[PDB]
Design an enzyme around this catalytic site. Structure first.
Site, short mmCIF file in Angstrom:
data_model
loop_
_atom_site.label_atom_id
_atom_site.label_comp_id
_atom_site.label_asym_id
_atom_site.label_seq_id
_atom_site.Cartn_x
_atom_site.Cartn_y
_atom_site.Cartn_z
N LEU A 130 0.84 -1.17 0.00
CA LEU A 130 0.00 0.00 0.00
C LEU A 130 0.88 1.23 0.00
O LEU A 130 0.46 2.30 -0.43
CB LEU A 130 -0.85 0.01 1.26
CG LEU A 130 -2.35 0.38 1.23
CD1 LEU A 130 -2.82 0.42 2.66
CD2 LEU A 130 -2.66 1.73 0.54
N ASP B 182 3.84 14.66 16.26
CA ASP B 182 3.98 14.59 14.82
C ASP B 182 2.61 14.66 14.13
O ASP B 182 2.29 13.89 13.22
CB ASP B 182 4.76 13.32 14.45
CG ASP B 182 5.11 13.24 12.97
OD1 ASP B 182 5.21 14.28 12.27
OD2 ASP B 182 5.30 12.10 12.50
N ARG C 173 -0.37 14.28 6.60
CA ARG C 173 0.15 12.98 6.19
C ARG C 173 -0.17 11.93 7.24
O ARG C 173 -0.18 10.74 6.92
CB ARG C 173 1.66 13.02 5.96
CG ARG C 173 2.49 12.87 7.20
CD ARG C 173 3.96 13.12 6.94
NE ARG C 173 4.30 14.47 7.40
CZ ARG C 173 4.85 14.77 8.58
NH1 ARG C 173 5.14 13.80 9.45
NH2 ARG C 173 5.10 16.04 8.90
N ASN C 174 -0.44 12.38 8.48
CA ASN C 174 -0.72 11.47 9.59
C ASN C 174 -2.15 11.45 10.08
O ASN C 174 -2.42 11.06 11.23
CB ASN C 174 0.19 11.77 10.76
CG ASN C 174 1.60 11.47 10.43
OD1 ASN C 174 1.86 10.49 9.73
ND2 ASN C 174 2.52 12.29 10.92
N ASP D 157 -0.23 7.39 13.55
CA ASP D 157 1.24 7.50 13.61
C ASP D 157 1.81 8.00 14.94
O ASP D 157 2.19 9.16 15.08
CB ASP D 157 1.80 8.27 12.43
CG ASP D 157 2.91 7.53 11.75
OD1 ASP D 157 4.06 7.77 12.22
OD2 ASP D 157 2.66 6.70 10.80
C1 LIG Z 1 -0.71 8.11 3.00
C2 LIG Z 1 0.10 6.89 3.44
C3 LIG Z 1 -0.70 6.06 4.43
O1 LIG Z 1 -0.58 6.25 5.64
N1 LIG Z 1 -1.51 5.14 3.91
C4 LIG Z 1 -2.26 4.42 4.73
C5 LIG Z 1 -3.49 3.96 4.31
C6 LIG Z 1 -4.28 3.22 5.17
C7 LIG Z 1 -3.83 2.94 6.44
N2 LIG Z 1 -4.58 2.23 7.27
C8 LIG Z 1 -4.17 1.95 8.49
N3 LIG Z 1 -3.01 2.37 8.94
C9 LIG Z 1 -2.20 3.09 8.17
N4 LIG Z 1 -1.03 3.50 8.65
C10 LIG Z 1 -0.56 2.96 9.77
C11 LIG Z 1 0.21 3.72 10.63
C12 LIG Z 1 0.70 3.16 11.79
C13 LIG Z 1 0.43 1.84 12.11
C14 LIG Z 1 -0.33 1.07 11.26
BR1 LIG Z 1 -0.70 -0.74 11.69
C15 LIG Z 1 -0.82 1.63 10.09
C16 LIG Z 1 -2.61 3.39 6.88
C17 LIG Z 1 -1.81 4.14 6.02
#
Ligand SMILES: */C=C\C(=O)Nc1ccc2ncnc(Nc3cccc(Br)c3)c2c1
Length: 308
Positions: free
Chosen positions: A23, A142, A146-147, A160
Site C-alpha cells: 500500500l 507529529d 500525512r498522519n 502514527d
Molecule cells: C498516506 C500513506 C498512508 O498512511 N496510507 C495508509 C493507508 C491506510 C492505512 N490504514 C491503516 N493504517 C495506516 N497506517 C498505519 C500507521 C501506523 C500503524 C499502522 Br498498523 C498503520 C494506513 C496508512
C-alpha cells in the site's frame, strides 16, 4: 500519569491474515493492506499491516513496539487503535484499514470536489481526536496531514504514534510542523501539538501545499523568530486564518485549546460558506462506503468488531 494502563495487547497469528498487498513504502517502513479473519469468528476485517523498515536492527523493534504500546492504549473515534500485533521475523502492527489513505494525499487528489463542509468538519474531527489525546495526556509530537487517515470522506482519524509521549515524560524530526519552543528548547507540550494542528489545518486549507516550500528546514527557526508565519490561503476568510494564526503564537498558553478549537470550528461548520470561500462549492459530491475483492458478505469494519 499514574493510573495502571490495562490495555489488552492482542497477538495475532500469521495464519489469520488472508490476502495481502503493498500500500506504501519509503524505507521509513512498509504498509500493507490485507484481511484478517479472527480464528473462530465468522468475520473478515479489512486491515493495514505495518512492518517498519530497518531490517531488524533491534533499535527498530524498540521503536515499533513503543508505537504499538501507544496505539493499543487509545480508544476514540478519531484516533486509530491497534488491532493487535503479529510476531514473525520483525514485528507487524495491525490496524483498521483506512480505505482512502492519508488526508494529505486525499486533498491533493480531490482538490476540486472538496466542499467547505468537508474541510471544516475534518478540523472538528481532528481537534476531537487531539483533545482525546490531551485527556490521556499524550503529546502526539507529529501531527500533520500525512498522519491523518480517511475511513470515509466524512470521517478522519489521527494516526502514527511513533513519537508520542506523556506530558512531562523524558525523551525523523518534522521542522515545518514544529512549534518554536520545540525547535529551540526541545520543549513539547499539548500546546505545541496545537501549533502543528494549526499547520495541518493550513495544509487542508491549501489542498495540500507544502509549508514554506522554498525555505530549507535549516533556517525555519530563524524565520519564525522574525515573526513570519505561513500565508493566508485563498479560500480562507480572516475568521479561519485568525484561528490558524492564534495557534502559531510565541506564547504557548496564548494558543487555542483543542477543546476551544472543536467549538470554534463546530460553530463555523453550521455555516461553512460564510467561513470558507470555495469556487462552486455547493453540490460538491464525494464518494462513500468500500467494495472490491471476491467474497465479502462477511466483511465487518473494525469499528464494529468489538471484543470484551
Ligand atoms: C498516506 C500513506 C498512508 O498512511 N496510507 C495508509 C493507508 C491506510 C492505512 N490504514 C491503516 N493504517 C495506516 N497506517 C498505519 C500507521 C501506523 C500503524 C499502522 Br498498523 C498503520 C494506513 C496508512
Amino acid at each position: 500519569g499514574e493510573a495502571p494502563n490495562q490495555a489488552l495487547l492482542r497477538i495475532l497469528k500469521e495464519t489469520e491474515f488472508k490476502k495481502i498487498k503493498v500500500l506504501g513504502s519509503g524505507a521509513f517502513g512498509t504498509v500493507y493492506k490485507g484481511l484478517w479473519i479472527p480464528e473462530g469468528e465468522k468475520v473478515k476485517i479489512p486491515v493495514a499491516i505495518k512492518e517498519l523498515r530497518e531490517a531488524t536492527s533491534p533499535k527498530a523493534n524498540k521503536e515499533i513496539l513503543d508505537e504499538a504500546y501507544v496505539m493499543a492504549s487509545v480508544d476514540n473515534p478519531h484516533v486509530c487503535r491497534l488491532l493487535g500485533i503479529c510476531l514473525t521475523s520483525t514485528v507487524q502492527l495491525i490496524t483498521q484499514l483506512m480505505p482512502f489513505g492519508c488526508l494529505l494525499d486525499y486533498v491533493r487528489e480531490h482538490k476540486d470536489n472538496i466542499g467547505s463542509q468537508y474541510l471544516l468538519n475534518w478540523c472538528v474531527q481532528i481537534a476531537k481526536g487531539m483533545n482525546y489525546l490531551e485527556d490521556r495526556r499524550l503529546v502526539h509530537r507529529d501531527l500533520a496531514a500525512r498522519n491523518v487517515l480517511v475511513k470515509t470522506p466524512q470521517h478522519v482519524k489521527i494516526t502514527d504514534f511513533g513519537l508520542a509521549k506523556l506530558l512531562g515524560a523524558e525523551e525523523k524530526v518534522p521542522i515545518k510542523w514544529m512549534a518554536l519552543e520545540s525547535i529551540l528548547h526541545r520543549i513539547y507540550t499539548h500546546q505545541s501539538d496545537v501549533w502543528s494542528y494549526g499547520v495541518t489545518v493550513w495544509e487542508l486549507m491549501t489542498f495540500g501545499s507544502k509549508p514554506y516550500d522554498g525555505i530549507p528546514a535549516s533556517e525555519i527557526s530563524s524565520i519564525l523568530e522574525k515573526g513570519e508565519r505561513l500565508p493566508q490561503p485563498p479560500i480562507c476568510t480572516i475568521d479561519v486564518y485568525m484561528i490558524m494564526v492564534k495557534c502559531w503564537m510565541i506564547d504557548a498558553d496564548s494558543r487555542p485549546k483543542f477543546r476551544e478549537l472543536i467549538i470554534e470550528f463546530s460553530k463555523m461548520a453550521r455555516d461553512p460558506q460564510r467561513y470558507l470561500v470555495i469556487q462552486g462549492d455547493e453540490r460538491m459530491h464525494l464518494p462513500s462506503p468500500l467494495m472490491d475483492e471476491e467474497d465479502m458478505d462477511d466483511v465487518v469494519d473494525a469499528d464494529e468488531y468489538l471484543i470484551p
